[PDB]
Write a protein that binds this ligand. Structure first.
Ligand SMILES: [Mg+2]
Ligand SMILES: [Mg+2]
Ligand SMILES: [Mg+2]
Ligand SMILES: [Mg+2]
Ligand SMILES: [Mg+2]
Ligand SMILES: [Mg+2]
Lengths: 124, 141
RNA sequence: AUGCCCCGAAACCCCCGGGCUACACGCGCGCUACAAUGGGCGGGACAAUGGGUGCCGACCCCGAAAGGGGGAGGUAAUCCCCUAAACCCGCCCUCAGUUCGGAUCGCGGGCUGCAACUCGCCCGCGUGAAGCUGGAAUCCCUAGUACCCGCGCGUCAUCAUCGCGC
RNA sequence: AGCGGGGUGGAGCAGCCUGGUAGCUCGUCGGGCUCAUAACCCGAAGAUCGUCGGUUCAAAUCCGGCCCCCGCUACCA
C-alpha cells in the first residue's frame, strides 16, 4: 500500500534524470519537458530547490499556472494565483504529472436564483 | 454438438450468432478486439458460437487472460501502461469497472479540476453549458 | 473624419495572471439520427471553381494510425494542392433499441505555439445515453430551378456543423 | 342537549342507489396567434376520496366507531 507510479517507489523517482522521468509521463508532459522550460519556471524551480536545501524559510508564491508538478516538489506548499488571490496547495505523491492550475479554481460554483423578468416568453 | 448457450469467462453467449459478434456481449470486448482474438486462436470468425468445444473455450479464456503474451499488439489493449505496475493490461467485467472507479476516485482525492467536475455531474471535456446539456424542469417566472 | 462635455498623474501608455467558454431554466438558426428508399467489408467509375515563396510540395525511406526524417520542380496554361462523394458489382446482417444511433466517460500516442489546467485540434483500444416519424402552429421554392452529394477560397501559427462560390 | 344532512386536486360540482376507469367548469405553470395585451388553440402538473375497522375475489360505493361542518326544535339569568 506504498506509492508507485509505474512500478517505482518515490525514491527511485527522486534519483532520475529529467529525461528518464519524461519517458514515464503522458505525452503532453513529455512534449512540454522536451521543448524546455520557460524562464519563469526556471526561477520557480530555483526557489523550490533552495527551499528543499534548508534555506528560504518563506512561503512560495507564484503566477505560473502551467508548471508541471515534479517529484522533488513533493511535501512543499505552494500558493497559486487564481486571478484574484493566492490559494495554498499541498503537494501529494499522486499529483505527479499535473499542472498546478488544476488545483486552483478560477470560477465560483453557481447557485441559481429565481428567474427574472424576460426569462420566459410571457414575462416580456 | 450444438449448444444454444455457451458460457465463456463468466458470461453466457448466444449460440446462434457468429463467434465474432457473440463475443461482444462481454463488457470490455468490442468487435475489433474480438476479431483479433478469433484470428489469434485460429478460429473462423464466421463460425456459429454453438459449435465451440471445451478445449476451444479454454483456449479463448487463456488468450483473454493475457493477450499481449499471445501476440496481440500493445497498441490494441484497453489499458496500456498501467498506472501502478507499468505494464500493458486488458481488463474485462468487474475488474474493468473497479479500475475505472479507482481512477475517478484518485482524481477526486487530490481535489483536481476533473474530480470536482465528476462529483458535480457536469461535463468534463470542456463543453459549453449555457444552451445544451439540459436535464430538468422548466421554472416559472 | 468631426463640434460640445468630461478624465488629464488617471478614464492616457506598457507588463503579469483571470474573464468574455459560468448553468435549475425560455427562445432563434443548424448538424446527426430514429434504419432496408439501409449498416458493414472487398473491388470498379466520372468534376469544376480557386490558391501557392513567412508558401505549394511530387518522389524515396521509417511507423498500425495520427504523424517523423530527406527532398526534384515551381515567382506558375509548364511544377504542386488534385486519382471527390452520392453511383455500380460481389459477400454478411433480416425488422431488432439491433451489426440502427454515437452522445458521455477511462487509458495510451501525436502536432501548432513563448505558453494547451482553466480553454485547442488529431489518432488507437474500450464504454454505449435519448431517440421507433414528431400537437397547436409555421418556412423555402416555377427549370439545369428545388431536393440529395461532395469540393475550393475567406478567416488562419493551430482550429469550420459558418460566410461567399464551384 | 336532542333529531336530521354532509366531508372527493387550489375552488364549485359528477361518479352512490346497481362495488371492478376517479370525470365536469374555473384556476396555476409552458408553448402557440398578434406590433403588444385580453379573448382563442395545444400539452402537462395536480385528489388515490376526512380518519379507523369490519365485509367482499376485489370498497370512495355496503356497514359500524371517531374528527369537523350545516340545518331544525326544546331551552329566562
Ligand atoms: Mg461571447
Ligand atoms: Mg454503426
Ligand atoms: Mg484542457
Ligand atoms: Mg425501429
Ligand atoms: Mg464567423
Ligand atoms: Mg396573449
Amino acid at each position: 500500500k506504498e506509492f508507485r507510479y509505474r512500478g517505482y517507489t518515490l525514491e527511485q523517482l527522486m534519483n532520475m534524470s529529467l529525461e528518464e522521468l519524461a519517458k514515464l509521463l503522458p505525452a503532453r508532459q513529455r512534449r512540454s519537458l522536451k521543448r524546455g522550460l520557460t524562464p519563469e519556471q526556471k526561477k520557480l524551480l530555483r526557489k523550490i530547490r533552495l527551499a528543499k536545501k534548508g534555506k528560504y524559510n518563506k512561503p512560495i508564491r507564484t503566477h505560473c499556472r502551467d508548471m508541471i508538478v515534479l517529484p522533488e516538489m513533493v511535501g512543499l506548499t505552494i500558493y497559486v494565483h487564481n486571478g484574484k488571490e493566492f490559494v495554498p496547495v499541498e503537494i501529494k505523491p499522486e499529483m505527479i504529472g499535473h499542472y498546478l492550475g488544476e488545483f486552483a479554481p478560477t470560477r465560483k460554483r453557481v447557485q441559481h436564483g429565481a428567474p427574472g423578468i424576460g426569462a420566459t416568453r410571457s414575462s416580456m | 454438438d450444438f449448444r444454444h448457450i455457451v458460457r465463456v469467462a463468466g458470461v453466457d453467449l448466444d449460440g446462434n450468432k457468429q463467434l465474432r459478434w457473440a463475443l461482444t456481449a462481454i463488457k470490455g470486448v468490442g468487435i475489433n478486439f474480438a476479431t483479433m482474438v478469433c484470428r489469434v486462436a485460429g478460429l473462423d470468425p464466421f463460425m456459429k458460437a454453438g459449435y465451440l468445444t471445451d478445449e476451444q473455450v479454454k483456449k479463448i479464456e487463456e488468450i483473454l487472460q493475457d493477450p499481449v503474451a499471445h501476440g496481440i499488439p500493445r497498441w490494441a489493449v484497453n489499458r496500456p501502461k498501467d498506472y501502478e505496475t507499468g505494464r500493458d493490461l486488458h481488463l474485462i467485467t468487474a475488474k474493468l469497472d473497479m479500475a475505472i472507479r479507482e481512477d475517478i476516485m484518485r482524481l477526486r482525492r487530490i481535489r483536481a479540476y476533473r474530480g470536482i467536475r465528476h462529483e458535480l455531474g457536469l461535463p468534463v471535456r470542456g463543453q459549453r453549458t449555457r444552451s445544451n446539456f439540459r436535464r430538468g424542469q422548466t421554472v416559472g417566472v
